[PDB]
Structures are given as C-alpha cells and as structure tokens.
C-alpha cells in the first residue's frame, strides 16, 4: 500500500512549525564586551574575566 | 471529533509559590494545634521517638452505652512535638486477640494517655516480636 510521494507531499512538512523552528531560524547575538566575540545571552566564556563578571 | 485536554489559560497556569512567603503557614499550624489544646481534644506532648517508643498507653473510645477501653504498648510515635499531624502506633492484645492501631490525636471521642513518657526498649522488643509472630502465623494459616 506504500507508494511514491509526489513533490507536493514532500513540501508539506515545511508548512508545519516543527520544521521551521528546527532548521531555519536565526540567533539573537551580541558582542562579548570582554572578548569582542559574538555571544548569546546566558552562555559565557572560559576566561577569568568572563567567569567573575558575566559579560 | 476533536477535544482538548490541556489548557494554557493564564489564570490556571499562574502560580503563587513565590508569594507564599507572606503567609505564616507554620504559625497557622501552631495556632490550630493550640486551639485544639485549649478545647481539650488533644494535650501537648514533648518526647522523642526512642523515649516514647515502648511505653504503656491507655485509650478510651467514648461510645454509648459503654466507652471501650484499650491498654496497649506504644510501638511508634510519628511526631515528637504537638501538631495537627500527630500520629501514634499502639499495639494491644485482648484474650487471644492482637491488634495494631494508629491513633491520631485531637479526636474528641478518643482520649489516649500514655502512662509514662519513659519507655522500656526491652518490652518494646518483646511486643514487636509477639506482633510479628502473630502476623506470620496469621499469614501462614491464610495461605
């Protein structure tokens, strides 16, 4: 009973929210005021400065 | 056809565990215990588990016409101080009849008094062995 699926049935998955939020989504980032690197808020660096104070 | 089991309603999903701090809940528990004490449904007690464990107790259950009296040995005390929780584990034997009761304090139709805060762990062990032997004999006769 299984059969080959037309290209339209292969593109139905991208209409759901599960596909959009998993693969194609951007990040909210800024520059680490102590490392000058892109950093997400919540995750810090190994350096002594970034551990004592959270940049 | 279709129904929904979960509700993301704000009024239902919001919680107050952060604001529970402004409620003196332990003070409310102590106030309820003190009200029970002043009414006479219970009497304050301050003993430890090993001290009370193994002390004889007499409990009278008020009942018209004749209140039923029962003398047993305290097997376990659930609380060391007085509270609305309470809990005592007594073991009493009649003529060829053993029984293990869990007396809660504060019942007006139930007056239980331990004859002495001091207890004898030897008598406690004797009562425990008697109860375990009776229970094992009952189970063996059943199965």
């Amino acid at each position: 009973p299984k059969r080959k699926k037309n290209p339209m049935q292969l593109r139905r998955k991208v209409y759901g929210l599960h596909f959009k939020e998993k693969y194609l989504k951007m990040e909210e980032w800024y520059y680490c005021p102590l490392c000058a690197e892109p950093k997400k808020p919540g995750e810090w660096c190994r350096r002594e400065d970034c551990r004592q104070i959270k940049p | 056809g279709y129904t929904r089991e979960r509700t993301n309603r704000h009024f239902f999903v919001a919680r107050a565990n952060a604001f529970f701090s402004r409620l003196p809940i332990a003070r409310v528990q102590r106030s309820l215990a003190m009200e029970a004490v002043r009414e006479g449904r219970m009497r304050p007690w301050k003993y430890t588990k090993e001290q009370i464990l193994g002390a004889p107790v007499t409990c009278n259950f008020e009942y018209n016409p004749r209140p039923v009296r029962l003398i047993g040995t305290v097997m376990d005390a659930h609380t060391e101080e007085t509270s609305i929780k309470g809990g005592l584990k007594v073991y009493a034997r009649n003529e060829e009849t053993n029984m293990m009761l869990w007396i809660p304090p504060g019942n007006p139709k139930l007056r239980h008094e331990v004859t002495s805060t001091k207890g004898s762990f030897q008598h406690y062990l004797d009562e425990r062995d008697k109860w375990d032997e009776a229970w094992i004999t009952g189970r063996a006769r059943m199965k």
């Binding site: 800024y30 808020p41 919540g42 004592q52 104070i53 | 952060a18």
Partner: protein, 49 residues
Amino acid sequence: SKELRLVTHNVRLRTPVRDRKCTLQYYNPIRARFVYRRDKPLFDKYHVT
C-alpha cells in the same frame, strides 16, 4: 482579464539585508524566567542584587 497580469511581472530586485533588528531589549519569554531566579552560585567577587 488575467492576460495583463500574465504578460506583466512584478519583482523585488534586491530586498534589504535580512539581518534581524536588535531584539535583546524587547520582551523575551526565555529570558523572562531568569529575571527572578536565584543566581548566588553564579558569581564570586561581584555579587549584585
């Protein structure tokens, strides 16, 4: 008719960059949980209330 729409196309030649605007200062549900969260073991010399 639709023959006019068929013969005449409409296009966006070069849309501006899709770079997201600064959204750190807006409301964010994932960062909302950390506003009242105890973070004592997160700092050593610079504890702030």
